[PDB]
Amino acid sequence: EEGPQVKIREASKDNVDFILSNVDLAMANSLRRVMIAEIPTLAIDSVEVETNTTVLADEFIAHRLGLIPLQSMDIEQLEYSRDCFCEDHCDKCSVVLTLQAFGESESTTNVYSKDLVIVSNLMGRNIGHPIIQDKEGNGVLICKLRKGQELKLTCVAKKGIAKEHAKWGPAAAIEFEYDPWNKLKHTDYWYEQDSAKEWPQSKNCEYEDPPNEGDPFDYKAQADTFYMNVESVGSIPVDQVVVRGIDTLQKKVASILLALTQMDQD
Template sequence: MAAATKNVEEIRSRVFLGEFGVKNVHTTDFPGNYPSYDDTWNMQEFQKNFRIDVVNLDENSMEFDMVGIDAAIANAFRRILLAEVPTMAIERVFIYNNTSIVQDEVLAHRLGLVPIRADPRLFEYKNPGEESADEEASEIDTIQLQLKIKCSRNPRASKDSSDPKELYLNHMVYSGDLKWVPIGNQADVFADSGIGPVHDDILLAQLRPGQELDILMHCVKGLGKDHAKFSPVATASYRLLPEISLLEPVEGEKAERLKTCFSKGVIDLEDVHGTGKKLAKVVNSRLDTCSREVLRHNDLKDVVKLGRVRDHFIFSVESTGVLPPDVLVHEAVKVLMSKCQTFLNELNSVDME
């Protein structure tokens, strides 16, 4: 009975990679899937097992482990990061003069996709359907940017030069040319915020002498599910933690081949008691990409067990730069909590009826 229970626990907690498919794929912890096995959800067990371990964190990217949750919850975090954490982006583009070869609508689309460094938590959503005329822009819901640039010939350029960089001035228009124009008291409130494009080197247009751009832009608060320009992440993905087990000792030439079947750093070779014979050892399964290359070798495929831990998710979050990645994850948690609270309120209202 104990052996059967242990077998069911392994099936529930692991996904195994076979030669021609994947075994034991389960996407839910919903109780009752396994006869004669008590898999009732327990709050105390969940609190004991759940954890988040930050593996790597820098200015624009973050890798962390989320352990002890169901795949549905992990995917909810991913989808919220992509589509439901608000940011500020260019929504209205007022083109007063555009004599470049780039059409107005193409230029407006390019401008809309430029990531804007501004904390959306400090702004409110603009009222739906409200016209964004110049005089109606408010300091509480709008950031105003301006692009005013004109190309001219460089009087100091060499007569024999053919390089546009030397011949012309302001012929390359970059996102760094966008200037923040404070509305109301924004100059005082956001004096230290550094509002503007995240990157200054995004090419927007190329000009020639006499051509110019005179554009005013309004940035508003929005969600990625309404338009991709509001998505705060370049990537937000997760994968299950790989688990590699050697079922028997692998030595010599077989060990050398086994090492080449996995990603660098997964398998290492150690000397057996100073005899010079090499023994394969699993060092870091996390680095494996689960390519299943080892299954192509008839003498190796039966000595290795390939699996993934079903409730251990390795998250990778890369911010566009509008907010640090750890702040984005924190905001995603808050959004999920808000959704849960809304659902509970609906249940309570049904019960009261």
């Protein structure tokens, strides 16, 4: 384009391994932070337990229900429950899905995330559907029932920020490394004998030129090249994770700019 550059090294459903070129450190860091915490996601926020004769406690189950990865594609055309003019929750802000499991066979009856059934009216929006990357097609193992044990409850999922709870976290671990040769000297290496033989050599060393001992220290160099690997949980596709991260940061900058526009009022 004209500014910062991207070079996608590896690309898949779960991971994006790319190189960020022509960017300030603070922007890369802030991007990472937003991607980690400040991206909207749908997750179980309320649990209404009717009958619970299982081993696990009520809120014990409710907790791991909260962590279940739900579809958050069209989450942007969903609304915060705190914003909606409804009582408690409705179809414009929340997605309600029920869970009804009971011990049938003599063997242990497993309760997965696939047993969750969307009830509320989605009215077209791709949302609420529990992510199943499982090979067998079961998904997250929620609970285990005996012979006559029953679990009947109702989940109300709401739009939330991962800054409020880690259950709304759209990504997992984001790999981040700049200057694989310590040419900026931001790190004084610890050693016992040799500094290079003890410390492992990064993969990202393949994409940069090694320093010459005949060359003096470059004191006027900054941080331009960054090596990132963003991993998604499933709720939001990787490309959409980084893109909505960017748009979120952009939007929250634009909110400050707008605030400055507003403070000029008498």
